[PDB]
Write a protein that binds this ligand. Structure first.
Ligand SMILES: N#Cc1cc([N+](=O)[O-])ccc1Oc1ccc(Cl)cc1Oc1ccc([N+](=O)[O-])cc1C#N
Length: 466
């Protein structure tokens, strides 16, 4: 992706979008009790922890674009994947507006707490002013959609989350785009049925894990990925995608029965118009992390990308024995024969991607189940039920999360979330975590699930159908 134009909002008539510039993250009541190195991302140029220039830092993920047409390797990749997806039977029929906006099986309602984006943010209007969960009303939305239309600017917020010292220092906070509610809703109509299928069918046919539940899905993964594991990181995936990849997605969607008009929306995503604070800018390429369906479309493209890289390097390759699962940029894959990931990474470089060893990592080492991670979790067969696998978030990551909070009022909810993660590290490690929690008085005011209970509920979770 590449920033093509930057002027001041002022000179084009847009008002200053006024995002909040102080973090919502404050030290929790457990900040002393546990150790960690992470802190709130930098949100403004003044922040005294900066050791570089914020404005430059945040936009620097737009590394450039490789000008190219869709080559022979892309085509066979698109075909093959298109092949897998055909088996799923995806309605290209639009989705009943009420379903797109307020829920249905395999697609949560629109989130009413997130931004409605332009122009509503300028005009003081929020989603709850336009939509009601209680009344499923659509008359107002319908006014707003017709009043204001589609293809509106996006609003660029700086993500307010924990980062490492290095990322705080370098100022490399992630950006998220808010799509105008109108566009959020259009897209959910156009592609709602697609989203629905991928959420309801995570794994090897979709090549996607978006929507999944690790407590349940982990146990399927080694079954679907029986070969020699392949896995790697990207640096700045979303922003590194050149237009050619969007082109491939377009094709892929057309083979699915979407028509040219139905695919204009990808150009919305690819060639984007953005508002940030007091500046206004266009971008050619890059996925705008946060708009409708961006994880799905990232995943889809990643399935096209990897296949493309295997083809261009391993000319004799048989893709029908390849298997991958993506969550946006996070991949785990397998083939029955060993594969040199570094070869792919240098193939990738040529298409403008920056692929790196799985986890931060010295070399593209061999990946085992011992060392494999996906969505930041490890895999560990249950000692007693070997066909069940535990998703194991590192307590390092759990410790970091519990030491902060955006709202102490949810402390209980927060800690029970972390409890559902922690017990996969096993009973000693759980009980110790609970001791430390209970070493402050708030600890003891919380209803916390017992190890034994989490275990039983997990085991019984495999009993009832799906
Ligand atoms: N793609 C996928 C995806 C993955 C994540 N994810 O990181 O898990 C978050 C959003 C994603 O798109 C959708 C995913 C799930 C559902 Cl149920 C709907 C999705 O489409 C959207 C719809 C509405 C809004 N909204 O403005 O409220 C945003 C999106 C997007 N963003």
């Amino acid at each position: 992706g590449e920033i093509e134009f930057i002027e001041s909002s002022k000179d084009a008539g847009f008002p200053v979008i006024n995002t909040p510039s102080k973090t919502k993250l404050e030290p929790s009541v457990f900040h002393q009790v546990f150790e960690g190195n992470k802190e709130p991302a930098v949100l403004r140029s003044g922040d005294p922890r900066l050791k570089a220039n914020f404005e430059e830092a945040i936009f620097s993920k737009y590394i450039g674009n490789v000008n190219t047409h869709v080559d022979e390797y892309m085509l066979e990749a698109v075909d093959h994947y298109a092949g897998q997806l055909a088996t799923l039977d995806i309605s290209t029929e639009p989705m009943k507006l009420e379903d797109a906006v307020y829920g249905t099986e395999g697609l949560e309602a629109l989130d009413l707490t997130t931004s409605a984006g332009y122009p509503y943010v300028a005009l003081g209007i929020k989603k709850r002013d336009i939509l009601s969960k209680k009344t499923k009303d659509l008359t107002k939305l319908k006014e707003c959609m017709d009043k204001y239309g589609l293809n509106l600017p996006m609003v660029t917020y700086v993500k307010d989350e924990l980062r490492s010292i290095e990322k705080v220092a370098k100022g490399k906070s992630r950006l998220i785009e808010a799509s105008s509610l109108n566009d959020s809703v259009a897209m959910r109509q156009t592609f709602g049925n697609l989203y629905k299928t991928f959420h309801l069918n995570p794994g090897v046919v979709t090549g996607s894990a978006v929507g999944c539940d690790p407590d349940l899905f982990w146990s399927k993964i080694p079954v679907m990925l029986d070969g020699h594991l392949i896995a790697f990181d990207y640096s700045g995936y979303d922003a590194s995608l050149s237009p050619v990849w969007f082109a491939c997605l377009k094709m892929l969607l057309e083979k699915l029965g979407y028509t040219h008009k139905e695919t204009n929306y990808i150009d919305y995503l690819c060639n984007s118009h953005h508002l940030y604070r007091d500046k206004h800018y266009f971008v050619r390429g890059g996925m705008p992390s946060g708009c409708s369906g961006t994880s799905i479309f990232n995943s889809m493209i990643n399935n096209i990308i990897i296949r493309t890289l295997m083809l261009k390097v391993y000319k004799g390759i048989d893709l029908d024995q390849f298997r991958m699962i993506a969550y946006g940029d996070d991949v785990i894959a397998s083939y029955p024969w060993p594969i040199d990931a570094s070869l792919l990474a240098e193939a990738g470089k040529g298409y403008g991607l920056i692929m790196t060893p799985a986890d931060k990592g010295e070399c593209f080492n061999e990946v085992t189940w011992t060392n494999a991670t996906f969505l930041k979790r490890y895999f560990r067969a249950d000692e007693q039920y070997p066909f069940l696998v535990h998703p194991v978030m590192p307590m390092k990551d759990i410790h970091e999360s519990i030491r902060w909070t955006k709202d102490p009022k949810n402390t209980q909810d927060h800690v029970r979330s972390l409890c559902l993660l922690a017990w996969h590290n096993g009973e000693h490690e759980y009980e110790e975590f609970i001791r430390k929690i209970r070493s402050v008085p708030v600890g003891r005011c919380l209803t916390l699930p017992a190890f034994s209970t989490l275990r039983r509920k997990w085991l019984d979770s495999f009993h009832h159908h799906h």
